Each structure stands twice: as structure tokens, then as C-alpha cells.
């Protein structure tokens, strides 16, 4: 499915992502638009090696989920396919475990390029949804 901005802010806040990893809701939401366009069917596969990114947060198969191709692992304990879904609870648990590594939200290239250094002070202004 595709969330609107605020839709997703309702849903992530709902789950305590709001101060999570020492990052605010705005951060998390901004990462989801530039990583996936708020769509739970975002998938990007690139064979340098069998890597591919899954879902709303674009969680990569080499470390974070288990699927059939080589470069898979499973820290989150999920089958990557649980990230192709309407439900984003597994996606929530795996983002939560990801931000907790030393890279923090820098594990997400689109956030680095698109939200880090932006003033997000008024990014959810129209969403106290």
C-alpha cells in the first residue's frame, strides 16, 4: 500500500518511533519518503552480489532478513517477504534494531542525502494526524 505522510506519522507514532534511536518522528517519516515513497511494495534489487532492499524502509537482505538469495542473513528474524506486505510491524521491529547499530540512521542513504541537514522543524506541521 502507499501511506500519506501524516498517515504514516499516525502509525509510527502509535508504535513509539517518535523519540526512537534518539531520532524524532520527523526523521523516521522523512527516511520512509525518500527510501520508498511511503510504499510498502518498494523493492530494489541490484546484482553486484545478490543484494536487494525490501519495503517501506528498504531493509536489505544481506544482514537483516532471510530470503533465498546468497546475500541474505537474519538479524531481524524475518523472512524478507514479511516486508512486502500491508502490515508494517515487522518493518518497525527491524528499523528499531537497525538504528541501534553504530551507523544510526546513516544506515539509510536516502536519509543521509535527504533528511540529515534538512530543517525538519515544520516537516510534519500539517500532520498532527
Indicate the CATH number of 1-129 among 3.40.50.12780, 1.10.287.890, 3.30.360.10, 1.10.530.10. Answer: 1.10.530.10
Give the start-to-end residue ranges of the domains of the chain: 1-129
* Sequence-distant (≥ 6) Cβ neighbours of residue 36 within 8 angstroms: 42, 55, 56, 57, 58
Q: Reply yes or no on whether 35 is catalytic.
A: yes
Q: Reply yes or no on whether 53 is catalytic.
A: yes
SS3 92: helix
Q: Within 13 Å of residue 29, how many CA atoms lie on the same side as its CB?
A: 27
Given in angstroms, what resolution was this structure solved at?
A: 2.5
Query: Could you give the CA distance from residue 127 to residue 75 in angstroms, rounded to a whole number?
Result: 33
Residue tagged active-site, from 18, 33, 53, 101: 53
The residues that bridge with 6 in the sheet, in sequence order, are none
Query: Could you give the CA distance from residue 21 to residue 84 in angstroms, rounded to a whole number?
Result: 24
Best CA proximity match to 21, nearest among 126, 74, 99, 89:
99
The angle subtended at Cα 55 by Cα 101 and Cα 53, nearest 5°, is 65
User: Is the CB of residue 78 less than 8 Å from the CB of residue 94?
Assistant: yes
Binding residue numbers: 82, 85, 87, 90-91
Amino acid at each position: 500500500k502507499v501511506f500519506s505522510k501524516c498517515e504514516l506519522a499516525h502509525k509510527l507514532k502509535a508504535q513509539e518511533m517518535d523519540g526512537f534511536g534518539g531520532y524524532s518522528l520527523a526523521n523516521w517519516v522523512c527516511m520512509a519518503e525518500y527510501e520508498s515513497n511511503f510504499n510498502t511494495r518498494a523493492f530494489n534489487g541490484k546484482n553486484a552480489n545478490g543484494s536487494s532492499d525490501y519495503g517501506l524502509f528498504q531493509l536489505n537482505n544481506k544482514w537483516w532478513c532471510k530470503d533465498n538469495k546468497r546475500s541474505s542473513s537474519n538479524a531481524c528474524n524475518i523472512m524478507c517477504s514479511k516486508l512486502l506486505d500491508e502490515n508494517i510491524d515487522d518493518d518497525i521491529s527491524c528499523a528499531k534494531r537497525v538504528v541501534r547499530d553504530p551507523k544510526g540512521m546513516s544506515a539509510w542513504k536516502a536519509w543521509v542525502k535527504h533528511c540529515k541537514d534538512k530543517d525538519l522543524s515544520e516537516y510534519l506541521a500539517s500532520c498532527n494526524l
